[PDB]
Amino acid sequence: TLVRPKPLLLKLLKSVGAQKDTYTMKEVLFYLGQYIMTKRLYDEKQQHIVYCSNDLLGDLFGVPSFSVKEHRKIYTMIYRNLVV
């Protein structure tokens, strides 16, 4: 199953090496992980915590922070950034 990122999510994924217009959810997740890691958006002392205020990721997700453990919340935030 392929999903289609909306334009600003697509820009975000391409910034960390993604190539296509449509993606498996696995690939979306890999590039979001790459983005958080490369920009060092996580809390060095509590590494599950992502601080995304002041970054495009937070603008798109609609939150200033979250934990990678919050799966339901993460997939809901991703769903907001996919074309219907």
- Beta-strand content estimate: 5-15%
Query: What structural class do you assign from the helix and strand content?
Result: mainly alpha
- H/E order of the elements? HHEHEH
Helical coverage, percent range: 40-55%
Q: Output the CATH homologous superfamily.
A: SWIB/MDM2 domain
Q: How far apart lie the N and C ends?
A: 14 Å
SS elements, strand count: 2
Walk across the major sheet and give the strand order: 1-2
CATH C-level name? Mainly Alpha
CATH topology: MDM2
The helix tally amounts to 4
Round the Cα radius of gyration to an integer and report it.
12 Å
Q: What is the total number of structural domains? A: 1
CATH architecture: Orthogonal Bundle
User: Based on CA inertia axes, which overall geometry fits?
Assistant: globular
Largest sheet: 2 strands, antiparallel
Organism: Homo sapiens (Human)
Subcellular location: Nucleus, Nucleoplasm; Cytoplasm; Nucleus, Nucleolus; Nucleus
Region (Necessary for interaction with USP2): 1-84
Region (Sufficient to promote the mitochondrial pathway of apoptosis): 1-76
